[PDB]
Amino acid sequence: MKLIVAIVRPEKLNEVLKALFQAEVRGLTLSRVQGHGGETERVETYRGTTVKMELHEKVRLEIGVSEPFVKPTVEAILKAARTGEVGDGKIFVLPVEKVYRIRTGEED
Amino acid sequence: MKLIVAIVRPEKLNEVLKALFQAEVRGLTLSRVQGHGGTTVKMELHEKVRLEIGVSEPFVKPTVEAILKAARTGEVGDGKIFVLPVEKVYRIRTGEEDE
Amino acid sequence: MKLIVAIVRPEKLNEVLKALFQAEVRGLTLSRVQGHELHEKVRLEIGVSEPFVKPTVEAILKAARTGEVGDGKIFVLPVEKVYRIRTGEEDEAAVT
Lengths: 108, 99, 96
Prior knowledge:
3 copies of one chain form a homotrimer.
Chain A: E1 2-8, H1 13-22, E2 28-42, E3 50-61, E4 64-65, H2 70-81, E5 89-95, E6 98-101, E7 106-107
Antiparallel strand pairs in A: 1-3, 1-4, 1-5, 2-3, 6-7
Helix pairs in contact in A: 1-2
């Protein structure tokens, strides 16, 4: 299956989890990180020009999803997360060799 | 190579760490993430320690087994392990590739 | 499109963010982690397209090496797809 990793605004988090519950995607982890979207060129007297790179509070979700659920998950997220402004986040779909459920001690 | 992402109970982090070392495993990196989705406790998020071992093909099963052994408790919320492909892993200090 | 996950020293964070800025990276996330007896480290995650992978690993290696143990590691992973949330556009359209 696949491992999805999405960076979403913090204020947009519940809107995302609500969307994910509706999509039937129960079971994921999250944590805050710091992300980057845009900059601003700054010219000055001392050492003139300097490029300001801004980092923002963001939430990284890491859902593991079966193939039939990649499109639903991504869609649910793009929609639940979109704002239209700079810094809305990003989604990555990654290859997952195996996924063991520590409990049972098996896969699935 | 492979990158093993282990999501375990903070309570079992120590055993998993002991099991992974008696199994010759370093380079490991970890952090805190939270799970979602006579008395009772109940929260929306559950504390988990997220391990992250980059490993060689030989020790992929040793790592995964050491972890599955040190983390299983039979209770829901035990966590999971993702074995993920890795195309090329470099060591910043010396600049290597298969280690 | 690849996913580059790099673990670097706190003290060498800015030097890399600088090097990545020059590598033409325009999107990346970072968080604090502990390497391993635990040590303080910064975990960076940049999604980059093929043309820039080789160049980005180099910019990091140069920028994060001090010689001592614990400089960190750089992993390169396969990415199925990348979506810029703001626009919904895939991969390259979701980079730079």
